[PDB]
């Protein structure tokens with residue numbers, strides 16, 4: 001299959017590598033055009049894939065069977081809209097990122113729009129990407145109009161196992177969002193590893209009470225206790241890690257906060273829910289951001 005991968009960062013190079021290894025015809029797409037896309041990825045078995053791949057070829061884009069989008073949330077919707085007039089109107093667009101609210105920005109996309117999440121881990125070390133952990137990728141329809149593109153899960157399962165189609169991808173994304181609304185801003189504000197959050201059960205539960213209220217009203221049934229329990233399992237699993245948001249703060253990069261607690265705020269507003277703690281996290285990270 002012919003794929004354009006938008007984003008040639010860690011996740012993009014993971015997908016580009018896996019795709020090349022199965023003989024799919026690929027290119028990269030870079031927001032800041034460069035003559036080619038550098039892929040330099042060390043697999044779980046220590047093998048190296050180091051390859052310069054085509055980038056930003058509009059004819060390749062125009063005949064691609066899939067646009068696979070691996071940008072950070074705040075980069076996604078502008079980049080996708082800028083390509084959508086070139087991409088054939090039947091060609092699916094699959095977004096994989098953390099955070100939510102890009103779909104709300106892509107309502108007028110005429111292409112099938114899909115969203116995805118994965119538990120693969122790919123970490124940048126220098127100019128090298130390391131495939132740290134294998135995992136599971138779930139994809140499904142982004143909006144109610146988007147139909148059955150499960151064939152894409154069947155193809156991608158042979159590229160980067162495991163992949164499954166989930167019509168209720170949106171419920172899964174909300175549950176991930178709930179965890180992200182806790183771990184990311186608290187770690188970024190407190191400049192601590194994820195496991196330190198254990199010591200703030202009151203603040204966690206309060207964030208979870210707020211998120212559960214919003215999720216409930218969005219039509220997905222959940223509990224503050226269920227979200228808290230999932231937050232603690234994720235914290236337990238990543239106790240020593242430095243969060244992506246804290247890494248962003250430490251490196252003086254723009255964060256994903258507008259698509260994490262920011263998105264929660266926009267959805268809370270729309271349902272008349274008061275979210276005082278999420279608001280504080282959001283404003284605090286925004287303050288930290290505009291010191292650099």
Ligand SMILES: Nc1ncnc2c1ncn2[C@@H]1O[C@H](COP(=O)(O)OP(=O)(O)OC[C@H]2O[C@@H](O)[C@H](O)[C@@H]2O)[C@@H](O)[C@H]1OP(=O)(O)O
Pocket residue numbers: 008009010011012070071072073096097098099116117118119120121122124244245247248253256
């Ligand atoms: N397992 C996953 N499941 C669903 N989404 C994932 C997963 N892993 C990452 N992503 C997301 O894809 C988007 C792109 O992530 P990367 O490929 O890591 O971005 P990029 O490579 O541009 O940035 C990575 C290097 O350059 C810095 O921007 C960053 O801190 C890192 O050292 C973000 O929303 C990234 O999420 P986040 O910003 O790392 O929380």
